[PDB]
């Protein structure tokens, strides 16, 4: 048990002003605090709320060594990829979850927040990569990707693609192409003092 009663800064993450681009997902550690998870589910303002390795239904009774809140933005069609053992540009090249993943995956539409007349091009995703991503790995490199047999010398063109490409977050877009904000709660349980707990 913690022995100290400090509410956890969950608001910092969900109600954050701007969200990171999925290729450079943001990660907030959470420790030395207490928080009511069931408040989130109860709010029921979210569109996807899927948990793996633990019951969502009022499971605050448990105490974990550390918690990790990973936040980013993607499309709706792509939310299906933020789960264990899924494939796709996002799960391969941007954000991978381990197959033994014990955590929760929360996603909600943000078309009002993250759309802009004429398109929002602040949110990128990685399109080309030589190898798939290992779980919980992050790649922020921008080196020109050389698809051809000839070298690129850091110049954009055919067979010489800039690896990151922008979402076309048009306000008039279909739901599958509307921005969605995603938060992934990972529960690091180890042989160490439990610094996060439930209520009371």
């Amino acid at each position, epitope marked *: 048990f913690p022995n100290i009663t400090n509410l956890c800064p969950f608001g910092e993450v969900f109600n954050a002003t701007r969200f990171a681009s999925v290729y450079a997902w943001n990660r907030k550690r959470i420790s030395n605090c207490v928080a009511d998870y069931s408040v989130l589910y109860n709010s029921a303002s979210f569109s996807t709320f899927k948990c793996y390795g633990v019951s969502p239904t009022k499971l605050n009774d448990l105490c974990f060594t550390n918690v990790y809140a990973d936040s980013f933005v993607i499309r709706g*069609d792509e939310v299906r990829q933020i789960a264990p053992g899924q*494939t*796709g*540009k996002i799960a*391969d*090249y941007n954000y991978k979850l381990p197959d033994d993943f014990t955590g929760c995956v929360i996603a909600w539409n943000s078309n009002n927040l993250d759309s802009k007349v004429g398109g929002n091009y602040n949110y990128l995703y990685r*399109l*080309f*990569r*030589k190898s798939n991503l290992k779980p919980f790995e992050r790649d922020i490199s921008t080196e020109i990707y050389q*698809a*051809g047999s000839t070298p690129c010398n850091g110049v*954009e*063109g*055919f*067979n*010489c*693609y800039f690896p990151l*490409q922008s979402y076309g977050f048009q306000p008039t877009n*279909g739901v*599958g*192409y509307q921005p969605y904000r995603v938060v992934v709660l990972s529960f690091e349980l180890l042989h160490a003092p439990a610094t996060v707990c439930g209520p009371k």
Partner: antibody
Amino acid sequence: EVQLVESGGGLVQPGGSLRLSCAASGFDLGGYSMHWVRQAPGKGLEWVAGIYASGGATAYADSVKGRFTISADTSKNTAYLQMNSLRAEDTAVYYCARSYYYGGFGMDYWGQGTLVTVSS
Amino acid sequence: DIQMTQSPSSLSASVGDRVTITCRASQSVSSAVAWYQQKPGKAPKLLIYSASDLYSGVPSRFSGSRSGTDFTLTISSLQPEDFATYYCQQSYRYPITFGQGTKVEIKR
């Protein structure tokens, strides 16, 4: 409503020249790459040439390298394929299409196509 | 200069069946494959891009998959409009190359 319309197709003798035009509407050529894809009767699809409208960079298929020349105009918002030293093998339906970026993406919109016949 | 080998060359199946079409690339193309549908006398219509991304205005039955350098197009259930020819296309290394083609014919 994005639209792509071909024009300039016709009949030409072997060794002649013919310039196909592809007028685009509902979008600006900037940031896109325009391609010419031909289909011989009852056969597969074969890519021919492509151009990044903004920078002007071009790319051609080995089978027609040198004979053909792809160009674009940003004020007219149209793309052109000049075809010189034509051969009977080049007889086909010529479509124009667009893709995002220099590559990695598909062809969103295709024109209805124009027939080119190369016969004496 | 990559080669896209497409199978099957021809396929006959009944309405409501689930269909699978495969395209194998000579080299790695990351996820730069696309799938098109063509009916007689009409331009190709874009179905899938970047391997597994649906295009706007395209029935959700169409799905796309990538296993290494093998790419797959799947129809959950066939409909009378889905009878036509299907091509795969790669936009990784120029010149961009299409597949030989897969014709889908209604069984009778």
